[PDB]
Design a protein around this ligand. Structure first.
Ligand SMILES: Nc1nc2c(ncn2[C@@H]2O[C@H](COP(=O)(O)OP(=O)(O)OP(=O)(O)O)[C@@H](O)[C@H]2O)c(=O)[nH]1
Ligand SMILES: Nc1nc2c(ncn2[C@@H]2O[C@H](COP(=O)(O)OP(=O)(O)OP(=O)(O)O)[C@@H](O)[C@H]2O)c(=O)[nH]1
Ligand SMILES: Nc1nc2c(ncn2[C@@H]2O[C@H](COP(=O)(O)OP(=O)(O)O)[C@@H](O)[C@H]2O)c(=O)[nH]1
Ligand SMILES: Nc1nc2c(ncn2[C@@H]2O[C@H](COP(=O)(O)OP(=O)(O)O)[C@@H](O)[C@H]2O)c(=O)[nH]1
Ligand SMILES: [Mg+2]
Ligand SMILES: [Mg+2]
Lengths: 431, 54, 52, 52, 437, 437, 431
């Protein structure tokens, strides 16, 4: 009954939440109207984690949708499965963000913060044992970066004992959809370091890689990219919603994957994932799930796991399976790829096992990795920031809305400090 | 627990998806994506005809 | 990065016609604040239009 | 766009028997297929281990 | 409710307005009498008109435009034409005498008589709206009302409205083609208001659009109608991200932030480039890569200056129609790995990609083919300084021995204004060349 | 996934392109208005057209060819004739003044007016490609557009598309039969673009094809249409391995690596067998041994040249039709045992075999009979120095008197071109002599 | 247990292994759809040597398909048993080798080798008791001569003790079909001699002669050749795949046939081979099988064993026979012509008698001979190599891709060393 409240900041965060709530509603049997139409009694047993009971059989998702432009809210409200949200959590402004971190953090967005905190405090009061907060947003945008980071700061100030996790779609230098992505990502990572408890880095280049070279998919667009992140979210949170032989909540994940407080940027994965032609040739077993889960072509961050050392690894399995083969696979991956695992942490791998698979599957797996290769993406963002910051290009937009260059220098210095910390703990010896 | 260590467990098993219209494949099993343009051939043919007539 | 976000069928390009033109990275040179205090960028950031 | 969908999502004709990727397997298989010949086994020394 | 006010100053503004509100009405289903049946609306449109037209509550869709011209000829041709009942009579404003290709007669005398009336109409159209995004100003630098009166008007909008974004679709004199003699003077004198009273300053060249019409649409004898139709297509492709759905749809200030690096640099090029006749469109794919390469081909630009002598600084793509982002990303990668396209060093990522789920609409009797994919590319290059320098030399050749200056002096405008405008032009040119190096 | 870009320059190039694309449309079953019906392509895949044709947005197929000429006669014949809707109008580029049998006029005066346009069209046709085998440049050495403009085009192509292969098919003058007086000058001047800007040069000879059509096709008065059909059969047999499936498939890179021993040595001799007629096809059984022995006879060669006085350095057998890879080895053994083929001492295995399971198609109104099997033999032989020595003799006969030089000098060519070109060809035939010994 | 990873490189290797999988699936009862529909449990008890179990009766062969052109992928899917392969194992580049060893090894094979090593690690770490790697390819091409030997190298220095055997369709002067065959063969034999453990050395000339003289076959084509080679590949592992009186797998074959490490170049032979005209004149006996084995026309290498000395002989018999007859028939073929056997290796014949003959046959027999006549093939390749390399013909194609002519010098010199080693070990006395 540990309640989790959801936040969807920005267009990307709102669409990811839109996919997330329908995968959760298919897992728990709730139709688009709100009524539970499931068959098993285990579905409507921990429904209070995400669903508040309204009048009748209606179950309202405990989610707050935040934006500044009304377009994405209108899309999610008029699309299919859009009438299940309460029509008071749709909090939005009427101006825009303009892909401006200052418009997300200091003006425009800061006026909406009081109303967002009002509805979030109401949704938190509706709980009984709220475990923490989850946020879906994208770095490199407008309200996804600035308004999301401001919301994280205010919520951390108000409830400084709760598990805060963000899902943080980071920019990539290869998809390149926005010029000021280095500014927004650099200014948002600095806020994400000292406020959140855990951050699951999502990258669009790796999402397109796992959409093209794994699932073929011809034309994947944004729906598949949000679907994969939503499935990862459900696989992470499944141990609070369903029972199992070896359970692990978000605090257990945070304890067993954060060795030092400034180390919480994670590499997610989900690995029943095969194409139409290879469905019949693939046999769904625990070694197959473990192999696809530890494959470097299956991560949703743009990293190469073989380019660094795995500090911690956690696998959340779902389905009826042998704990013996689960354990010996989690040990076999370490004994073969012992060079990609760090030496001063013996048995870097946490195992969680749930007994309820996702609806339509017989077994599933979810990867969370804390490898020291995320310094590659952070170094790319830092070098792009300094490349377009040496000549102070596109900086009048940010400095005309109440932000000094001292904040830019502090963000760059702290993010290089984070990179140096990751490199130091990668290159640290055993004894 | 014989279903969990049966020697013929793979013999008595279904792959994941079987066909294009599997009732198991919903929005949670993620063996069914909307990106698979199964109607893409018909849509492309419609576009060829429509450009031709225009 | 070795991740390939592009589709399978990729059209030809100058990298396949002539060759790969990637050069290297210059070592860094002057530091960030000295690079900021150069004339025809600091002047542009200092001087602002009435509309701005 | 158009008020009415030209090709509705429900009125689609999926392939049927074994589904194959058109991204890596470009050519399709028209499959009433010729299976190879089967040499009939020797009736008394086909499968008889010396132990049995 | 993401409203924008369209102000069309001069004969070139008014004719662009005629070719542009025709496209807007035919895109949003507005009849020339002012009603939406149901059929000609975009599916799920309902209120999608509500950035160009306003309900009267009874069905009338009054456009959010101010047509201004000191000469009462072309505006009364609007008042007589097919969109007679579409426009409110106060939206179409005339004087008595035109400025006669004179910036002084447009800015100090004559034109200083109806600027307050135009501003009152703009204020009425502004407080009728609730979510005003900005003002799109259409005029020319040929001279008179399009330069002097548009200078005065855009100046007073700049000092009044402030935070509203003032886009300019200015018509520029060509390197060799010119319909008047005093165009260099009238174009030098108005650079201050495009320089310090405009947030973005898209410019088009009549000779460049002539060349595009002759090569692409197979019209050996094009005209101002086809030119204004192409300009209207550009503006529609720009503004459709405020009207219809899309994945990464932009909202004016979004591509301003992703386009201008510095406040002084707000003069980009605008290329709509699936531009083709129907017979030639019968023999091409017109795919995403094709319509992306056509933008960077230095023969489909609407200003006669090839960007191969300069460096790109920020390119904003505005895609329309069945354009999945998986093809746009491959097209952007091909553009980045192209030889001749050179980006500036301090802009590592320089592509603001936006996609709208709405293919372009086609006017009957039009010259463009009915494609399903569109690109409007707004690129900030260090190559518009070529046009600036051509203007500068054509101005200096005249100001060396002071031709036609008595017309400007005898109607206000003390002699130092020419030198001051020349000096700020030289400052802007210096800024662009030092950015390019 | 394979593509080859065809560039047809000159009148001979345009007419060879007409016959060649008639042959390709017949082979791939494309109607002259551009539509492929029933999409089966027996003996090959569905994408078998992709080497030579590309899909459009309307379901039509457009060829990947560019027909350039400095004279509007033959290009207008293409644009008026039956293959009118097949070609893209931008692919058929023509000028106003032809080069008038002048290498200087084609290379320095008139070619530098549409060189940019042909490069842009080649850039579009190459950007719409997914795997590029190379370019096929069809031209004549007789002079003018086919020499000077072809030289300029290949000089630009060598620096732009450095990695891509560039095969050329050039019409070489006969020892006696000739139609131009300045063509020795043009042929000497065009050697440099075939030695430093070409990867393989198939040289064909009008007299040799005349003799072939006289003694084998049984027609007393063949013409350029017949010559171009037989020339097009060569390139169809070359690209058969790219298009249709077969046992041994040889693409252009494998072809060049197995053909040319040295970078300067890239001038082979082409021949085809059978070239039999319909009445003569009744009286003999055309098998692999007969067609291979016919290919090595010094009468079916398509350069007036005896290869029995030279040494074969490498040979590419290209079988096409009812060919089993054991009859091939039998024929190769018989050829290796028989005497008049003398192989060079540094090539023990001198044969590269490509077998394709698709019989050659018959053109209605043609002369070649429908045959079970055929073979194209492409041999690098040290005997082409005889033809180049004949050319050097004919050039030095006139350059001593310095006739027809004022035209080239007035059009812009410096007189040192003739000296360095004759020196280059003399050193090149010395290179073949040294390679042979 | 005792798993074999099959790899097929190039067009010739792909076609030969396709016929091999047809033969193996016919022997094991696997249908062209992949399901098992056999008649006895002996076909199922050792199915995991070449196959992986999937859901249902599906069996996926443990094969890796490599070529640098996509047309081979269509040519291998055009056959029966073409859909049994996993689509993830179809690793094909989009280009073409161009009959260039440097292209296959240094420029574009280097871009494909990482993916092939990834899929072979896929097919190798799933095996509990992985025994060896088999590779079928042709020297003379660009992918078999290039990419194939590169694969031999990476598989070697990733797996030390696993038995590597290559089947190696070597070139021939009489078949020819390619000018740069001496260059490719000379450059590939260096990686063959240092990184393999058993090389079987088939050529097209002896294959034509076998399909031509003792089988008649007016149209011999390539399918019959691949059938003969595939029958040999099945006969060299029938003791691994089926029970028998004497068992000798690949490790025992490598022990009993390799006296010294650079002497592992064998010649194969499979000998229930008669024409259909001569078919009714047979006795169908073990002496007939042994005699038609040791006949010097059924060797699948053009080397004449009469012009050489047999170091070791292996005979894998298959069917129901008597050990006394087998031992007598492989003892008298030493005692009679003992002058063709080395004196310093006494009783240099090892026999392995299985119990399950191939489907449709009563008895079969596979001959492997480590004769010292392989120097004939090597000397023909050398005498064709030294004519081209003297005038440096076709050398710019190889040397424009980073390669040096000292590499050709090493290839020729080390091959001459191999020839001299074979000559010294055939002319060495007892004492
Ligand atoms: N593209 C385009 N340009 C036009 C059109 N009409 C006029 N122009 C431009 O306008 C220039 C002439 O100046 P005008 O715009 O007519 O002057 P004005 O703004 O009407 O003010 P007055 O001088 O008082 O008439 C010419 O050089 C044209 O380039 C048009 O319909 N389309
Ligand atoms: N085989 C063949 N050769 C041709 C054909 N047409 C022209 N030629 C050759 O072309 C030579 C004449 O020069 P052209 O090719 O016409 O010159 P051009 O390329 O058109 O360039 P200009 O002289 O400037 O017009 C003759 O010697 C012919 O050998 C043809 O249809 N078939
Ligand atoms: N995975 C995914 N990424 C998205 C989606 N929508 C936008 N993005 C990415 O988010 C970035 C822009 O962030 P945005 O959503 O505009 O933030 P906002 O300005 O606060 O609305 C772009 O680079 C997109 O690539 C989506 O639906 N899914
Ligand atoms: N036995 C046999 N030999 C073949 C086959 N295919 C090709 N070859 C031989 O291999 C040589 C060419 O090798 P190739 O297939 O081009 O190698 P690749 O370039 O690596 O694919 C030719 O001389 C053929 O004789 C086949 O299916 N069976
Ligand atoms: Mg006027
Ligand atoms: Mg001509």
């Amino acid at each position: 009954m540990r309640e989790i409240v959801h936040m969807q900041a920005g267009q990307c965060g709102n669409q990811i939440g839109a996919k997330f709530w329908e995968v959760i509603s298919d897992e728990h049997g709730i139709d688009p109207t709100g009524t539970y139409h499931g068959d098993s009694d285990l579905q409507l047993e921990r429904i209070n984690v995400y669903y508040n009971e309204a009048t009748g059989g209606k179950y309202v998702p405990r989610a707050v949708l935040v934006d500044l432009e009304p377009g994405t809210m209108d899309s999610v409200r008029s699309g299919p499965f859009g009438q299940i949200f309460r029509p008071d959590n749709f909090v939005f402004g009427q101006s825009g963000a303009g892909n401006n971190w200052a418009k997300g953090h200091y003006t425009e967005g800061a006026e909406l913060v009081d109303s967002v905190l009002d509805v979030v405090r109401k949704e938190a009061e509706s709980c009984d044992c709220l475990q923490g907060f989850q946020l879906t947003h994208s770095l490199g945008g407008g309200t996804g970066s600035g308004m999301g980071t401001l919301l994280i700061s205010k919520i951390r100030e108000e409830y400084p004992d709760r598990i805060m996790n963000t899902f943080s779609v980071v920019p990539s230098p290869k998809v390149s959809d926005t010029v000021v992505e280095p500014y927004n990502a650099t200014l948002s990572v600095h806020q994400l370091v000292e406020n959140t408890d855990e951050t699951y880095c999502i990258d669009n280049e790796a999402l397109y890689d796992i959409c093209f070279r794994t699932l073929k998919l011809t034309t994947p667009t944004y729906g598949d990219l949000n679907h994969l992140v939503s499935a990862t979210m459900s696989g992470v949170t499944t141990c609070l919603r369903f029972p199992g032989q070896l359970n692990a909540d978000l605090r257990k994940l945070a304890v067993n994957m954060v060795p030092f407080p400034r180390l919480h940027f994670f590499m997610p994965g989900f690995a029943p994932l095969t194409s139409r032609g290879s469905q019949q040739y693939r046999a769904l077993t625990v070694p197959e799930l473990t192999q696809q889960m530890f494959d470097a072509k299956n991560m949703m961050a743009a990293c190469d796991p073989r380019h660094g050392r795995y500090l911690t690894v956690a696998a959340i399995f779902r389905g009826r399976m042998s704990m013996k083969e689960v354990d010996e696979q989690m040990l076999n991956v370490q004994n073969k790829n012992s060079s990609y695992f760090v030496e001063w942490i013996p048995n870097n791998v946490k195992t969680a096992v749930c007994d309820i698979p996702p609806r339509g599957l017989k077994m599933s797996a979810t990867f969370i990795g804390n490898s020291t290769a995320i310094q590659e993406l952070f170094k790319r963002i830092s070098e792009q920031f300094t490349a377009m910051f040496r000549r102070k290009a596109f900086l009048h937009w940010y400095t005309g809305e109440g932000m000094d260059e001292m904040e830019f220098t502090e963000a760059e210095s702290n993010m290089n400090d984070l990179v140096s910390e990751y490199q130091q703990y990668q290159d640290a010896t055993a004894e | 627990e014989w279903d969990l260590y049966d020697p013929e467990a793979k013999k008595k098993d279904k792959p994941a998806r079987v066909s294009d219209d599997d009732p198991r494949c919903g929005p949670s099993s993620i063996q069914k994506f909307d990106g698979e343009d199964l109607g893409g051939k018909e849509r492309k043919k419609l576009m060829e005809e429509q450009m031709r007539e225009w | 990065s070795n991740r390939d976000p592009y589709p399978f069928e990729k059209l030809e390009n100058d990298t396949s016609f002539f060759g790969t033109n990637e050069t290297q990275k210059m070592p860094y040179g002057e530091p960030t604040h000295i690079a900021q205090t150069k004339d025809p960028w600091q002047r542009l950031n200092s001087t602002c239009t009435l509309a701005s | 766009g158009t008020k009415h969908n030209p090709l509705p999502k429900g009125a689609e004709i999926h392939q049927r028997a074994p589904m194959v990727d058109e991204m890596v397997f470009k050519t399709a298989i028209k499959e009433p297929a010729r299976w190879p010949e089967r040499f009939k086994r020797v009736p008394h020394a086909g499968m008889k281990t010396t132990m049995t | 409710m993401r409203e924008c006010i369209s102000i069309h100053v001069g004969q070139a503004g008014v004719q662009i307005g005629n070719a542009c509100w025709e496209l807007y009405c035919l895109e949003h289903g507005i009849q020339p009498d002012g009603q939406m049946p149901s059929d000609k609306t975009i599916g799920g449109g309902d209120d999608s008109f509500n950035t160009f037209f306003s309900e009267t509550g009874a069905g009338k869709h009054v456009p959010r435009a101010v047509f201004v011209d000191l000469e009462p000829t072309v505006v009364d041709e609007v008042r007589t034409g097919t969109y007679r009942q579409l426009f409110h009579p106060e939206q179409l404003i005339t004087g008595k005498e035109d400025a006669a290709n004179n910036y002084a007669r447009g800015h100090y005398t004559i034109g200083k008589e109806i600027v307050d009336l135009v501003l009152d109409r703009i204020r009425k159209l502004a407080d009728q709206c609730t979510g005003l995004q900005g003002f799109l100003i259409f005029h020319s630098f040929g001279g008179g009302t399009g330069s002097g009166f548009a200078s005065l008007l855009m100046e007073r909008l700049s000092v009044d409205y402030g935070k509203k974004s003032k886009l300019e679709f200015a018509i520029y004199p060509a390197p060799q083609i010119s319909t008047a003699v005093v165009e260099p003077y009238n174009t030098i004198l108005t650079t201050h208001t495009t320089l310090e009273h405009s947030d973005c300053a898209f410019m088009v060249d009549n000779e460049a659009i002539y060349d595009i019409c002759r090569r692409n649409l197979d019209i050996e004898r094009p005209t101002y109608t086809n030119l204004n139709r192409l300009i209207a297509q550009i503006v529609s492709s720009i503004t459709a991200s405020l009207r219809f759905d899309g994945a990464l749809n932009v909202d004016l200030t979004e591509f301003q932030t992703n386009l201008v690096p510095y406040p002084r640099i707000h003069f980009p090029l605008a290329t709509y480039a699936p531009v083709i006749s129907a017979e030639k469109a019968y023999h091409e794919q017109l795919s995403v890569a094709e319509i992306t390469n056509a933008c960077f081909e230095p023969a489909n630009q609407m200003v006669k200056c090839d960007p191969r002598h300069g460096k790109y600084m920020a390119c904003c793509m505005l895609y329309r129609g069945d354009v999945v982002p998986k093809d746009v990303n491959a097209a952007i990668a091909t553009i980045k790995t192209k030889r001749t396209i050179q980006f500036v060093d301090w802009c590592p990522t320089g592509f603001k990609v936006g996609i709208n789920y709405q293919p372009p609409t086609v006017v009957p009797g039009g010259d463009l083919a009915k494609v399903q994919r569109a690109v409007c590319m707004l690129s900030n290059t260090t190559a518009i300084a070529e046009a600036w320098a051509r203007l500068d030399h054509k101005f200096d050749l005249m100001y060396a021995k002071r031709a036609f200056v008595h017309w400007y002096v005898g109607e206000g405008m003390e002699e130092g204004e020419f030198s001051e405008a020349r000096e700020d032009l030289a400052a802007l040119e210096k800024d662009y060349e030092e950015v390019g190096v």
